[PDB]
Design a protein around this ligand. Structure first.
Ligand SMILES: CCN1/C(=C/C(C)=O)Sc2ccc(OC)cc21
Length: 353
């Protein structure tokens, strides 16, 4: 198709999605060449940026629906702040190259990245990342969100699907008659600032994906940057073991697993929560001898039990993870503090770049 003709021939479906396929253009500039993702928000497509010598971008095209348009405007405000504050592009938040309003569709152009860390784990038959990879990805997440936290921002939806490799090319360790895979370059970027909240802005009550959600959110006690620290702790567990720390889809059971894995919920948090129906006389309501009781009993053990090795680097990892999974968000380690944790003495100079 021709740039001008294609960019002006435009229509939406009954749901407010842009009708488009591979080959279509936007802004006499972006040529759609692949599909990367879709949701209720809209769609993400790979494009060639013909105004920047056909360099590759991920273009997010938001639905022509007021709720999603407004949310996208707020997302752009966050991305603009990140860009304003990271002139060397060294804080590892996804680079927004362009944004525009295409017939009511907010569109955001990003640098093109590789597979997300969940997809890579799944392609490795959920065999975990080796500890040095866990350590480098942890360092990068602490560095990226410390920067976001210094700028009165909280991501609120950190999960492995929102952490992408710059380049996900892998090496084969073994291929016996699942092919065992390690990523070559563990450089990552954080994506999807579509839930990211400034300190002064309205806070959505229930944030984060289930498995990465902290106790102060479940208990509706208010949340801020420590929410993201809890998420990171859960992510690092999952990188290290290949399975989620909290495999549950119900609040009371989730809070029970937290107490079995991490120790007792602080008294003051139970006193203050409106979620009183989960408690009786200050203790979580929980039948140990039911089927769910036996699953939790068998599967949810003290955090340290999940160590695969007893050496110093594993002990250091678990100390940092424990500090990231403090119940009380006011006692939870900050990412500025996390960057100084002795776990990160095991990095190399390349890994500090
Ligand atoms: C589809 C994932 N995805 C995004 C998703 C959202 C909701 O923003 S943004 C993004 C940027 C680059 C990329 O490369 C592969 C992927 C990418």
């Amino acid at each position: 198709q021709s740039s001008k003709r294609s960019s002006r021939s435009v229509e939406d479906d009954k749901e407010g999605h842009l009708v488009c396929r591979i080959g279509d253009w936007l802004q006499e500039r972006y040529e759609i060449v692949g599909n990367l993702g879709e949701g209720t928000f809209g769609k993400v497509v790979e494009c060639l940026d013909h105004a920047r010598g056909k360099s590759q971008v991920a273009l997010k095209i938001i639905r022509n629906v007021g709720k999603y348009r407004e949310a996208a405007r707020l997302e752009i405000n966050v991305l603009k702040k990140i860009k304003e504050k990271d002139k060397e592009n060294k804080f590892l938040c996804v680079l927004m190259s362009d944004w525009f309003n295409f017939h009511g569709h907010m569109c955001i152009a990003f640098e093109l990245l590789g597979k997300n860390t969940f997809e890579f784990l799944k392609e490795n038959n959920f065999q975990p990342y080796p500890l040095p990879h866990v350590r480098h990805m942890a360092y990068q997440l602490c560095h990226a969100l410390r920067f976001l936290h210094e700028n009165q921002l909280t991501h609120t939806d950190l999960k492995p699907e929102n952490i992408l490799f710059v380049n996900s090319e892998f090496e084969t360790l073994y291929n016996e008659h699942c092919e065992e895979k390690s990523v070559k370059n563990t450089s990552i970027r954080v994506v999807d600032f579509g839930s990211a909240t400034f300190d002064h802005e309205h806070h959505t009550t229930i944030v984060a994906t289930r498995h990465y959600r902290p106790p102060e959110v479940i208990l509706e006690l208010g949340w801020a940057q420590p929410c993201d620290v809890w998420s990171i702790g859960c992510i690092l567990f999952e990188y290290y073991r290949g399975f989620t720390l909290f495999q549950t889809h119900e609040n009371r059971e989730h809070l029970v697993m937290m107490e079995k894995i991490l120790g007792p919920i602080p008294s003051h948090m139970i006193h203050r929560t409106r979620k009183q129906k989960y408690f009786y006389k200050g203790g979580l309501v929980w039948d140990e001898n039911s089927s769910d009781g036996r699953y939790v009993k068998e599967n949810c053990k003290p955090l340290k039990s999940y160590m695969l090795q007893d050496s110093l680097e594993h002990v250091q990892l678990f100390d940092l993870m424990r500090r990231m999974l403090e119940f009380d968000p006011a006692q939870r380690i900050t990412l500025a503090e996390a960057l100084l944790h002795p776990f990160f003495a095991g990095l190399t100079p390349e890994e500090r770049s």
